């Protein structure tokens, strides 16, 4: 626990960036400036109870707006169904992680405020109140189902437990032994307030939204088709779209086969657009073939279709390269120089003469074997 | 592009299903922009004319035609639906639900075999047919 507390302290001190200049806008001053808000002086327990009631009411409004009358939310913010959900109802009940996270936040607030009202009633002592607050802030995961909806929150939970290990083993020295009487809730309260700071904008954005008012070739083909058919006479585009699509497929096939493609009756603007489309698709094709080959050779999990396709693509690419190499040999002539060749020939003839090698004759007609 | 015919209302769908008597009606519920629908529709166009003798393909937009969402549980980004003589054909792909494909296979031969099996089982009289392949495992290694 000490080591992990040090780890998080170091991470905070290292990932720290200086704060950025603002214009100093205060939310509550703006709220007070409007007619919808008014100021007063109230007991903390009273506003805690009022906030709990308002949260319960707002969650009820959000639930009922979706007409999800089959889900009931109690005063402890534990949402439970009342009947077996239909698949349509089950999909309708998918509130997302934001709603559940806000509900569990309101449940934690309800827990803290309820402990405070329990102390104010007089049922428990102030020491019991402080110890209960320490337990609440050290056992949020157990008392409240927060970690499932936000995974990162789990980290905070461990912090709290670590902090408990930091306090208890110092609190429980000397005459004091293990027991449920240790109340020191500064650390966990700090941690959960710091979590609330981070998650406040997310839940506000979610509530504002809820209360308002690979396949490059296919997309390339669709976009070029849209561009061509926009610049198309209305009365002629009935079959010319299919004809130009057939032309696009033929051009792609012709490029894939290293064969000339020159439609005589095709106008030169459409022909140039088709040439550009084929160039772009060929670049993507080559790049994705190389990427897939690297992925397969490295050892990535692939199915049969991918390998088959890659092999086909690579085959086409390798024959393109082989044709280029043959043409380069034809253009640049023989790569071996004449004197180099005669040196090799003299070496071979000297070897064979030194071996007294008799040349192999043409398969004799009466060959015995 | 999407040269495959589209149905713009529930009326087009419900007389398209009853239009074909000797051919299997294939309906793709989804959205063109949806990539998965793009893959499936490319596959379908690759085999649109191969199965012209015994099959037909229609594309239905969920936003344009949302009346079948509740009855057919059209909650996936994309579904493929097989009908013959007004009767739906369930296909046992091994994915858990036999009513809809709900996925885009890159190999057109798999879809050709699926539609051929559906046709064979529909003409023979079985309402539920078995896919000649198991799609529970992606067969990637």
């Amino acid at each position: 626990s000490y080591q992990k507390l040090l780890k998080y302290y170091v991470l905070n001190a290292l990932k720290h960036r200086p704060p950025k200049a603002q214009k100093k806008r205060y939310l509550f001053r703006s709220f007070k400036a409007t007619k919808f808000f008014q100021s007063t002086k109230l007991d903390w327990v009273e506003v805690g109870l009022q906030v709990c009631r308002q949260g319960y009411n707002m969650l009820n409004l959000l639930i009922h707006r979706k007409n999800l009358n089959y889900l009931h939310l109690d005063y402890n913010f534990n949402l439970k169904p009342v009947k077996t959900l239909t698949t349509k109802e089950r999909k309708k009940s998918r509130f997302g992680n934001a709603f559940h996270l806000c509900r569990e936040v309101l449940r934690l607030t309800k827990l803290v405020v309820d402990s405070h009202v329990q102390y104010r009633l007089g049922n428990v002592d102030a020491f019991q109140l402080a110890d209960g607050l320490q337990y609440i802030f050290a056992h949020v995961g157990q008392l409240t189902g927060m970690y499932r909806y936000k995974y990162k929150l789990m980290r905070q939970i461990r912090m709290c437990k670590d902090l408990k290990h930091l306090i208890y083993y110092r609190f429980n020295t000397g005459p004091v032994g293990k027991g449920p009487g240790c109340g020191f809730w500064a650390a966990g309260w700090r941690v959960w307030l710091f979590f609330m700071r981070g998650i406040t904008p997310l839940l506000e954005r979610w509530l504002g939204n809820l209360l308002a008012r690979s396949h490059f070739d296919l997309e390339l083909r669709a976009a070029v088709m849209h561009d061509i058919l926009d610049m198309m006479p209305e009365g002629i585009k009935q079959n010319k779209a299919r004809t130009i699509l057939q032309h696009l497929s033929e051009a792609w096939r012709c490029w894939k086969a290293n064969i000339p493609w020159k439609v005589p009756g095709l106008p030169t603007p459409i022909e140039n657009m088709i040439l550009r489309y084929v160039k772009a698709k060929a670049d993507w094709w080559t790049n994705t073939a190389h990427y897939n080959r690297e992925r397969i050779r490295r050892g990535a999990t692939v199915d049969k279709t991918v390998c088959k396709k890659n092999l086909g693509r690579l085959t086409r690419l390798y024959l393109k390269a082989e044709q280029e190499r043959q043409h380069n040999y034809l253009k640049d002539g023989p790569y071996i120089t004449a004197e180099e060749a005669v040196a090799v020939y003299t070496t071979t003839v000297h070897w064979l003469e030194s071996r007294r090698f008799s040349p192999i004759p043409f398969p004799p007609l009466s060959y015995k074997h | 592009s999407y040269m495959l015919p589209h149905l713009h209302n529930g009326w087009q769908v419900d007389q398209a299903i009853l239009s074909e008597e000797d051919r299997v009606v294939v309906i793709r519920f989804g959205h063109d922009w949806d990539p998965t629908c793009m893959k499936m529709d490319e596959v379908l166009y690759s085999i649109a004319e191969k199965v012209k003798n015994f099959a037909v393909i229609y594309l239905v937009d969920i936003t344009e035609v949302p009346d079948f969402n509740k009855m057919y549980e059209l909650y996936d980004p994309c579904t493929v639906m097989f009908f013959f003589r007004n009767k739906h054909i369930m296909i046992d792909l091994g994915t858990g639900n036999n009513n809809k494909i709900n996925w885009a296979m890159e190999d057109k031969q798999e879809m050709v075999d699926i539609i051929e099996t559906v046709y064979r089982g529909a003409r023979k009289g079985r309402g539920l047919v078995v896919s000649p392949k198991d799609y529970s495992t992606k067969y990637r290694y």
Binding site: - | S1, P5, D32
Partner: peptide, 13 residues
């Protein structure tokens, strides 16, 4: 026919 779907695709993408 094809253009009607192309305009829908372009608008939605």
């Amino acid at each position: 026919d094809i253009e009607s779907s192309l305009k829908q695709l372009a608008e939605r993408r």
